[PDB]
Amino acid sequence: EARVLEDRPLSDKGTQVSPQRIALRLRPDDSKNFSIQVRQVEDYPVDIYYLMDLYSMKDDLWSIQNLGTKLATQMRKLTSNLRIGFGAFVDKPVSPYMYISPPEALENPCYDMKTTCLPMFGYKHVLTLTDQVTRFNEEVKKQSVSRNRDAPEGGFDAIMQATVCDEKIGWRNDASHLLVFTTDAKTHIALDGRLAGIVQPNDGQCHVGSDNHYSASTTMDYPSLGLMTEKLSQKNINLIFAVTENVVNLYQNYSELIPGTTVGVLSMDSSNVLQLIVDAYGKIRSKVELEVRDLPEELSLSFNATCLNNEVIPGLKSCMGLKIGDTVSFSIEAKVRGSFTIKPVGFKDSLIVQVTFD
Amino acid sequence: FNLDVDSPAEYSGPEGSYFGFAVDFFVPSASSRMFLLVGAPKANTTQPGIVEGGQVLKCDWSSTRRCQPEFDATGNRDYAKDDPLEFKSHQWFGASVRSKQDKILACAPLYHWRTEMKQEREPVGTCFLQDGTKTVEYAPCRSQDIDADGQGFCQGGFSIDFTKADRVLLGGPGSFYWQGQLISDQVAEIVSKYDPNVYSIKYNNQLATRTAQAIFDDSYLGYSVAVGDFNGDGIDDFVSGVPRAARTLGMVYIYDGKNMSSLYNFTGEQMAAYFGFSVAATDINGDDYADVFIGAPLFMDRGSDGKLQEVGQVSVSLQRASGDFQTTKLNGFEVFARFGSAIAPLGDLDQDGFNDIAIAAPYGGEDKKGIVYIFNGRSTGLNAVPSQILEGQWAARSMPPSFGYSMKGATDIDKNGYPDLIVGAFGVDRAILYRARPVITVNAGLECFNVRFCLKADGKGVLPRKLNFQVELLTISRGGLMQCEELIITIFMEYRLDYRTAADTTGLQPILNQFTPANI
């Protein structure tokens, strides 16, 4: 049987899944049917953590000088709780990535072109998620750029640390999380660290201390596409690849390996990031897909999506064709042959299925 | 299945010194011993003014089990007063350690030096060669082609492998804007053209790859290397892994051992899977050709329902006479186990007539202590299912134990007829040795009530003359004819071999075959 045991209405404006705690009870070698009802709530709170990459991106800093105000003017038209954060990364400050050759390049890595630059840093958390959009502006003016010898950078370290650090970044427990990722170069994927002498795998723990720097840059290797995926779904974070036109195809293929990621064509000076993010909101909340945790090994479940207008799509667990928010339903079977959680990707609401075998 | 687990040889080292990052045997053609060359790339030497240079240690097998290291005993050299030339500190001496007869090639990839022209630091990479009483330094990438545009950031000695004709092959994945490079020089040329005053040596038989276009930028050619025949002649060919090969998919290049032309290329399937992290060339089906084994520890297999889980993947390619390859992939077992990290050939582990291979997952199993898988090849390829499971025994201390990240096989240290395996666990800075127990095969018999139960046995290598079995129905000579007795519905008999008496001085208890039954 399947006792509902809990059900609250799909909330009108900013509860998303209708049944909260079903009470499955299976005789061996049998299967019954579930129920689900997603509701993309309009005007849901939004948090945007602007993870930027700063030498070829020095013009981007000037072109996004007033971004928080332009964000607020064009984001409060679809939400009422908006928070902005800022973080930066270049690459690990270790040997085969940074200019340590001249004795004065540790302090000024750009002592070749006759200018000034910041010493290279691994990951920097600058601004926590605040509702004050002017703090974004006044903190982004105090940002300069650094220089790295290699072409690939430490982007995945920054994404990982932003995802796992929760008090430092201040992702709300009840919010729609957007992570922006703007860069114009490739990335040093996992295992790109024994060239630098780093062979200790990433653990997932967050090491941004009170100094706001990733303290394990020269001690731990880059994260992989599995550790990142395992942590991007645990904390329900959506990642947007605001990359240039020379890295779009590269980051599109990484995107089609992690659920909940998209790409955007970031201009040469990040002069179209507002429209990019706004369109990325309508491309992140337009897709509803379901993912499972802690499924018993002796259980197998099918997924019959019923979306659009009373469709009978036989097998898909995800639906395309949502504009802002729609009420779609997926039926479920579950065979035993002798707590498991159903939840959408990017949201905390779930159907906690209670299973008791008799 | 024949590897011992009960009593393995252990080998410790300095704390946090990465003892076991490189493991290799040391068989000399000048004596009657077999030592263990184990590298500790983060150890502290007695060189004055050098911190964490690293060292390579020789470990005795039949002794008090002591371990003692001297490729160099000098500090930084001086190019003009008040400024040094090289900086051997934190140089990772011991990241690679190879051996062939009385030759020991130990390299420090993260070695820096001040190029004569500017005043800078460049990880060119350094190596050291020892042929007995003569030890020499080998730095092919320490040339006048400087900076990242040349061989300045070469990281030479990252991966090395000897050649059957003494044509050692070097891979440095940072040469020419990290496009990667491979360098092969004769051992005769290395020792002959060696001075302590000439920094750049041009040699004469320099087989080196040259720079390509900017499309192949940051590809890391030279991550791993191997030697094997793939053109048809007698000269071994260089197989190298390119994990970031221009789309991070991963490619593997096979060059030639004579003029170094592009012979064969492989390509990966999943991006950021590291197709080419480790390579190994051997024969797994006994056709006298050379097979290839490319590891992809970060491959993300599609799970049962719809999920992608990272388990690792090793690609098995079988050489054919026409040059084409037959490819078959075997996926990892555990999640985040890095299966396909250290593929070490073992030779004839059980002397079944076909060579066997070892694939290790350094971060998989119980408490992620590392597990080594053993595979035995047939004349169809190799068995998909593992033949033995090896497990770590030391819990992680600060660092992951990383058991199985470094391995080396196909060498008999007992001279007992079966080769042996050495496994390095640098996280717990331990090195371990497993001895292949001898293998016996038994053919059974059992052809008023008249019953007659027969049995005979045989094996290879060192083995006691007579084996005491134990048979009950409900001493047999090794190599003799069918010995049996006759004494006067299902009738059941079993033969349980007496391992304890069939042991030897150390004990090396023999093992029975794999497919043989015991109940009839």
Which residues does chain B have within 8 Å of residue A99's beta carbon, measured at their own beta carbons? none
- CB-nearest to B148 from A102, A149, A229 is A149
CB A33, CB A301: distance < 8 Å: no
Write the residue in A149, A194, A200 that is nearest to B400 by C-beta.
Answer: A200
CA of B271 vs chain A CAs: smallest distance (Å): 7
Contacts of A300 in chain B (CB under 8 A): 305
What are the Cα distances from residue A297, in Å, to A338, B285, B305, B390?
Answer: 11, 37, 12, 26
Segment holding A189, helix H or strand E: none
Rounded to an integer, what distance in angstroms lies between the CA atom of residue B211 and that of residue B245? Answer: 14
Asked whether residue B71 is marked as a ligand-binding residue, the answer is no
Distance linking the first and last C-alpha atoms of chain B: 23
Contact B356, B420 (CB under 8 A): no
Using N-to-C axis directions, what is the helix angle for A68-75 and A133-140, rounded to 10°? 150
Check A250 against B248: CB less than 8 A apart.
yes
Distance CA B467, CA B477 (A): 6
Which tokens hold the place of A247? 């890295």
Nearest to A159 by CA among A276, A282, A49, A46: A49
Cβ atoms of B472 and B453 closer than 8 Å: no
Name the residue among A149, A191, A229 with its Cβ closest to that of B298. A191
Residues of B in contact with A101 (CB under 8 A): 118-122
Contact A191 B174 (CB under 8 A): no
Superfamily the domain B9-437 falls into: Integrin alpha, N-terminal (2.130.10.130)
Give residue ranges of A with CB < 8 Å to any B CB: 95-96, 100-102, 149-152, 186, 189-192, 194-197, 199-201, 224-227, 229, 250, 253-254, 257, 292, 300-301, 317
- Helix H, strand E, coil C: the string for B195-221 is CCCCCCCCCCCCEECCCCCHHHCCCCC
> What residue spans define the domains of chain B?
9-437, 440-512
**Contact criterion met (CB below 8 Å) for A313 and A306:** yes
Residue B256 C-alpha from the chain's centroid: 22
DSSP string across A298-332: T-EEEEEEE-TTT---SS-SEEE--SS--EEEEEE
Q: Tell which CATH classification among 3.40.50.300, 3.50.50.60, 2.60.40.1460, 1.10.1740.10 matches the domain B440-512.
A: 2.60.40.1460
- Cα B114 vs. chain centroid, distance in angstroms? 34
Pairwise CB contact (< 8 Å): B310 & A226 = yes
Is residue A268 annotated as involved in ligand binding? yes
Residue B355 annotated as part of some ligand binding site: no
| Cβ contact A226–B400 (<8 Å) | no
CB B4 within 8 A of CB B16: no
Rounded to whole angstroms, the Cα distance separating B211 from B200 reads 19
Q: Are B286 and B378 contacting, i.e. CB atoms less than 8 angstroms apart?
A: no
B383 annotated as belonging to a binding site for a ligand: no
Which phi and psi angles does B458 have, rounded to 5°? -160, 165
Residue of B nearest to A303 (CA): B305
Q: The tokens 């001075």 sit on which residue?
A: B195
Shortest alpha-carbon distance between residue B41 and chain A (Å): 10
Chain B residue whose CA is closest to A228: B310
Q: Which residue of A has its CA nearest to B214?
A: A151
B378–chain A nearest CA distance, Å: 33
Q: Say if B197 is an interface residue toward chain A (CB within 8 Å).
A: no
SS3 A274: helix
A61, B390, B439, B478, B502 from B505: Cα distances, Å: 75, 24, 17, 19, 10
Question: Nearest CA to CA, how far is A101 from chain B (Å)?
Answer: 4
Q: What dihedral do alpha carbons B292, B293, B299, B305 form, nearest 10°?
A: 90
Q: SS3 for A137? A: helix
**A101·B243 Cβ contact <8 A:** no
Residue B192 neighbours by CB under 8 Å, 6+ apart: none
Q: Please give the Cα distance from B127 to B139 (Å, whole number).
A: 6
Torsion of CA A232, A236, A242, A243, to 10 degrees: 10
For residue B418, say whether it is annotated as part of any ligand binding site.
Answer: yes
Check CB contact of B395 with chain A, cutoff 8 Å.
no
B158: nearest Cα among B176, B174, B135: B174
Q: How far, CA to CA in Å, does B499 sit from each of A146, B154, B467?
A: 68, 54, 8
- CA angle, B495 as apex, B436 and B391 as ends, to 5°? 30
Q: Please tell me the distance in Å from B37's CA to the nearest CA on chain A.
A: 21
CB contact under 8 A, B217 and A197: no
Domains along chain A with CATH numbers:
25-40+289-357 (2.60.40.1510), 46-284 (3.40.50.410)
Is A226–B248 a contact, with Cβ atoms under 8 angstroms apart? Answer: no
Residue B324 annotated as binding site: no
The distance of A200 to chain B (nearest Cα, Å) reads 7
Mutate to test the interface with A, among B87, B308, B429 (most CBs of A within 10 A): B308
Interface size between A and B, measured as CB pairs under 8 A:
87
d(CA B6, CA B149): 53
Under a CB-based contact definition with an 8 Å cutoff, are residues A79 and A116 in contact?
Answer: no
B416 is in an annotated binding site: yes
Q: Are A269 and A58 in contact (CB under 8 A)?
A: no
Q: Is B47 on the interface with A (CB under 8 A)?
A: no
Q: How far apart are CA B29 and CA B37, in angstroms?
A: 16
Residue with tokens 């302590």: B196
Q: Cβ–Cβ of B271/A101 closer than 8 Å?
A: no
Hey, are the CB atoms on A191 and B123 less than 8 Å from each other? no
Helix, strand, coil % (nearest 5) of chain A?
20, 25, 55
Asked whether the beta carbons of residue A254 and residue B270 sit closer than 8 angstroms, the reply is no
What is the bridge-based pairing of β-strands B135-138 and B126-130? antiparallel
B71 interfacial to chain A (CB closer than 8 Å) = no
Give A-chain residues touching B402 at CB under 8 angstroms.
199
Q: In the beta sheet, which residues pair with residue B265?
A: B253
Residues of A whose CB is below 8 A from B305: 292, 300-301
Contact A286, A278 (CB under 8 A): no
Q: Report yes or no: B195 at the A interface, CB cutoff 8 Å.
A: no
> What is the DSSP code string of B258-300?
SS----EEEE-SSTTS-TTSEEEEE-SS-SSS-EEEEEETT-E
Is B285 assigned a ligand-binding role in the annotation? Answer: yes
Q: Hey, is the C-beta of B119 within 8 angstroms of any chain A C-beta?
A: yes
In contact, B280 and B344? CB cutoff 8 Å: yes
What phi and psi values does residue B177 have, to the nearest 5 degrees? 60, 40
Please tell me the distance from the alpha carbon of residue B243 to that of residue A191, in angstroms, as a whole number.
Answer: 10
**Tokens read off for B11:** 């080998």
Is residue B287 a known part of a binding site?
yes
